[PDB]
């Protein structure tokens, strides 16, 4: 492994939003594929199910559409019509109280989900451990 292995408390039972405290945004996976945030919680594409993999590792995916969330060969997070490598990310606890996700097929290099500021989501060689664009807090839907 390159990456600790912290794991969150949460489990998978129900759908949750994964909001970004970096600038208070849900994450989102619209129709056509593209990735932001939103900060409007009656968005239909914010509702996502996660399921585990292997433990510490998980599919994120839109109830709304059954696209699955996934980090391409660049760092560009897409939404996938089938759940493949570039789906699976490793699900951590970071400061003892968020959750982190990190590309597997890209976790030697720290490719993380990120939010920034402004709602837009963060290539992966520009996130890094430290950033608040990272981290994630899941909340019921």
């Given at each position: 492994?390159?990456?600790?292995?912290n794991?969150?408390?949460?489990?998978?039972?129900?759908?949750?939003?994964?909001?970004?405290?970096?600038?208070?945004?849900?994450?989102?996976?619209?129709?056509?594929?593209?990735?932001?945030?939103?900060?409007?919680r009656?968005?239909?594409?914010?509702?996502?199910?996660?399921?585990?993999?292997?433990?510490?590792?998980?599919?994120?995916?839109?109830?709304?559409?059954?696209?699955?969330?996934?980090?391409?060969?660049?760092?560009?997070?897409?939404?996938?019509?089938?759940?493949?490598?570039?789906?699976?990310?490793?699900?951590?606890?970071?400061?003892?109280?968020?959750?982190?996700?990190?590309?597997?097929?890209?976790?030697?290099?720290?490719?993380?989900?990120?939010?920034?500021?402004?709602?837009?989501?963060?290539?992966?060689?520009?996130?890094?451990?430290?950033?608040?664009?990272?981290?994630?807090?899941?909340?019921?839907?």
């Amino acid at each position: 492994h390159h990456h600790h292995f912290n794991l969150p408390p949460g489990n998978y039972k129900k759908p949750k939003l994964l909001y970004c405290s970096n600038g208070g945004h849900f994450l989102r996976i619209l129709p056509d594929g593209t990735v932001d945030g939103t900060r409007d919680r009656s968005d239909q594409h914010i509702q996502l199910q996660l399921s585990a993999e292997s433990v510490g590792e998980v599919y994120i995916k839109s109830t709304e559409t059954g696209q699955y969330l996934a980090m391409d060969t660049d760092g560009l997070l897409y939404g996938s019509q089938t759940p493949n490598e570039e789906a699976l990310f490793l699900e951590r606890l970071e400061e003892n109280h968020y959750n982190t996700y990190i590309s597997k097929k890209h976790a030697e290099k720290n490719w993380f989900v990120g939010l920034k500021k402004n709602g837009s989501c963060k290539r992966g060689p520009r996130t890094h451990y430290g950033q608040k664009a990272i981290l994630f807090l899941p909340l019921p839907v």
